């Protein structure tokens, strides 16, 4: 019925008044707010803004609600156009969601005036100067703990113990290890007793890492204060102190997000390598088993060669000695480069997204 | 109030006169300059130019000042449109900055009529024919200096000196080295005494390189004209004569710019390699230490294998001998290809930018 002709700098937009008033909380949806720009001389709402953006601004009313930025309008110009037309904050949220920007505030800081002071001081390194100092202290303790874990294995440092087992505070490594574990437990208990909600603390992967980085020390201490397999499993598990370096590194966080996103592609990479390894190890075992000098004793033994030829490591311990085995080894290296080159670009695209999104 | 209707070949642009006269130094901002195209018969400024470009040209007035080239208009056409509408030279500078072109003239040539003649002759190889000759002479001296540095180490050339230390101008290598150092010092002192400002000379990396390429010779000469550690450090530092080849090579300059730009990505690459090396060396030490034939004596010793498996060099000196060690070595080569493949595309994008920008 009623026809409203908008004029965005000479460009007429004749639309039905019903669609214009579908959203009555905007600049055009309020008749007493859009009367400022109305021109009674020509019976049109003359604006003096960007011309291409108003097409999307009008499609917002003509589609109920939908904000799709035209590909020929820059982000800032379109955002300013949304702000001028006062489409709303839900409009801005939909626009940012469509573009790719993600809006997540959360961060429920405690309001007890002391359960938030220490929480800020520890969780947020940039909240203070002492907070940055605490972050630096944590990084230093993590690095020396890694150094201790690696140095404990050097044969030189184990001289009086380098005798057969059949013929703890004095050990210099145990002192540094227990200081590192004390600091880890301290920064864990402070964060747990200063977190807003215990549900989020027991769910964050960056806190499960800190738990796993403390568990082996206490298992070993309890066992000492009185099986072999669990002991070696635990001594290997102790390596997860390098992953609590990810709280202080935005590169490791991006890497973790990339690996979580590219789970299907990592699985495809492993599956393709498994298929190729079985195929080429069978081919090179049967192509080389009649030569009395071959060192493939079985298809399971030719898997190691096939993985080092497909990955193009090629150590050279296991190689073919026959013409047919060398033909097979020639296609393993080429078919390995393709198998690997296929999903890795998808993983790299995920990394670039999470990296430049930062 | 006053309404001006522009007509870019049938396409009306009705804008407020105030926005049109916001910039009074342009073709449309001068009423006595835009009267040429005015059409009193239809009360419109009829132009006969490209239609899509005038949208951006009018947004320049409607946004105070801003030049954003429409994505559907070519660079040359839009530049010609800016030139026709006489928006100004600051408008052209903003346009080039938005596109990506960088404007840097500088080059403060001396005006002493002789402190610039030699400066041109040396700094700019294309200013003359003798300048090109000087550039060629510099490249030749650099190449023979590199050749001398490499040849001095050959065991064959050291025959009468190949006796234990316990049982200088005669040496043929010292003569060529001192001639090269004389030319390096000459081309450095001429450039320093012919530069416009001494502040820029003592700040350019391409001059710090020339200083470092001369320092070891004079340190050695002073020490000879009378410690061991600094002597070997200096003998290694002498290798930085290859980097003064970067003045004469635009590929090395692009490489240096790429490496300065991709500093965070180089750091991430090193950090990811360090994380993976520690992880897989711990895994392969603990997965293989119970085999009496293993050659990983410690986690620090399995780092070398992990770096050569992750980088897929795979020399083959250190390899796994156990089933678990071979499973671990299989994931080191795959997780190394991902770790490396992640930031290298960012570095390559930087190189392509700095390379095609040339």
């Amino acid at each position, epitope marked *: 019925g009623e026809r409203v002709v908008i004029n965005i700098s000479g460009l007429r937009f004749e639309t039905q008044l019903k669609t214009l008033c579908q959203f009555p909380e905007t600049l055009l949806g309020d008749p007493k707010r859009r009367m400022r720009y109305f021109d009674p001389l020509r019976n049109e709402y003359f604006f003096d803004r960007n011309r291409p953006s108003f097409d999307a601004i009008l499609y917002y009313y003509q589609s109920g609600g939908r904000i799709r930025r035209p590909v020929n309008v820059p982000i800032d110009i379109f955002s300013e156009e949304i702000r001028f037309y006062q489409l709303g904050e839900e409009a801005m949220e939909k626009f940012r969601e469509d573009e790719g920007f993600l809006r997540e505030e959360e961060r429920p800081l405690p309001r007890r005036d002391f359960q938030r002071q220490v929480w800020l001081l520890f969780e947020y390194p940039e909240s203070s100067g002492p907070a940055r100092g605490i972050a630096i202290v944590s990084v230093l303790v993590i690095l020396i703990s890694i150094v201790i874990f690696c140095l404990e294995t050097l044969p030189e440092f184990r001289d009086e113990k380098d005798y057969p087992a059949s013929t703890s505070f004095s050990d210099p490594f145990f002192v540094v290890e227990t200081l590192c574990i004390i600091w880890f437990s301290f920064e864990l208990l402070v964060r747990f007793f200063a977190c807003p909600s215990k549900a989020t603390f027991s769910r964050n992967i960056m806190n499960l890492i800190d738990i796993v980085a403390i568990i082996p020390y206490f298992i070993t201490l309890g066992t000492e204060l009185a099986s072999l397999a669990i002991l070696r499993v635990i001594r290997l598990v102790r390596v997860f102190r390098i992953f609590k370096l990810s709280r202080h590194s935005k590169g490791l966080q991006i890497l973790g997000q990339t690996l979580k996103a590219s789970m299907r592609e990592l699985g495809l990479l492993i599956f393709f390598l498994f298929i190729g390894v079985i195929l080429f190890s069978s081919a090179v075992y049967f192509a080389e088993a009649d030569d009395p000098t071959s060192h493939f004793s079985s298809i399971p033994d030719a898997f190691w060669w096939a993985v080092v030829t497909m990955t193009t490591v090629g150590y050279g311990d296991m190689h073919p000695v026959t013409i047919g085995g060398k033909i097979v080894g020639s296609l393993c290296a080429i078919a390995g480069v393709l198998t690997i080159a296929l999903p890795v670009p998808v993983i790299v695209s995920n990394f670039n997204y999470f990296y430049h999104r930062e | 109030g006053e309404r001006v209707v522009i007509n870019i070949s049938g396409l009306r642009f009705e804008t407020q006169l105030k926005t049109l006269c916001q910039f009074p130094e342009t073709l449309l901002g001068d009423p006595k300059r835009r009267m040429r195209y005015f059409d009193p018969l239809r009360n419109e400024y009829f132009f006969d130019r490209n239609r899509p470009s005038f949208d951006a040209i009018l947004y320049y007035y409607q946004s105070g000042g801003r030049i954003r080239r429409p994505v559907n208009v070519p660079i040359d056409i839009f530049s010609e449109e800016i030139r026709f509408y006489q928006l100004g030279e600051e408008a052209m500078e903003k346009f080039r900055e938005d596109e990506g072109f960088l404007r840097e003239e500088e080059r403060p040539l001396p005006r002493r009529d002789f402190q610039r003649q030699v400066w041109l002759l040396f700094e700019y190889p294309e200013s003359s024919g003798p300048a090109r000759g000087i550039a060629i002479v510099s490249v030749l001296v650099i190449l023979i200096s590199i050749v001398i540095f490499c040849l001095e180490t050959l065991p064959e050339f050291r025959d009468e000196k190949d006796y234990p230390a316990s049982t200088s101008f005669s040496d043929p290598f010292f003569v060529v080295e001192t001639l090269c150092i004389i030319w390096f010092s000459f081309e450095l002192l001429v450039r320093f005494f012919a530069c416009p400002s001494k502040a820029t000379f003592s700040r350019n990396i391409m001059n710090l390189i020339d200083i470092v390429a001369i320092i070891p010779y004079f340190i050695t000469l002073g020490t000879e004209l009378a410690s061991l550690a600094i002597l070997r450090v200096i003998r290694l530092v002498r290798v930085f004569r290859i980097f003064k080849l970067s003045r004469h090579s635009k590929g090395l300059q692009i490489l240096g710019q790429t490496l300065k730009a991709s500093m965070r990505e180089l750091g991430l690459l090193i950090f990811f390699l360090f994380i993976g090396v520690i992880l897989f060396s711990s895994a392969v030490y603990f997965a293989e230490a*119970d085999d*009496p034939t293993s050659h990983f004596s410690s986690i620090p010793d399995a780092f070398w294998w992990a770096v050569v498996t992750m980088t897929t060099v795979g020399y083959g000196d250190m390899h796994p001998v156990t089933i678990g060690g071979k499973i671990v070595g299989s994931l080191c080569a795959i997780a190394g290809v991902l770790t490396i493949a992640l930031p290298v595309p960012v570095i390559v994008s930087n190189f392509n930018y700095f390379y095609h920008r040339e």
Partner: nanobody
Amino acid sequence: EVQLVESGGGLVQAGGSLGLSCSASGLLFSRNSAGWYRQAPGKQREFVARIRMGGSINYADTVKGRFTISRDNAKNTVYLQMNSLKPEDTAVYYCSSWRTGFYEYWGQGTLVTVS
């Protein structure tokens, strides 16, 4: 599995010389600590010598100077040159190769009876 066979018998009297040898199968001596242990009848194990991986040779407090220990790293054998033999050192000299915290391997033993 792994066996550290030894060949060090004989009945050399006081004085003279005798060289015991220890050979390994499935174990590389260049990659493990090695050391001879003795055990006289009616007594317990007595440390004699040890050559760590890296040649940190250290003998006991009694047989120093008069004994020496060596390794090949190519023939995969660990030796023991018994010089200045005395009737005091009559025992069944064993051979042991080990890795600290992972495994220890012994030999059935060889008999050196000094008259």
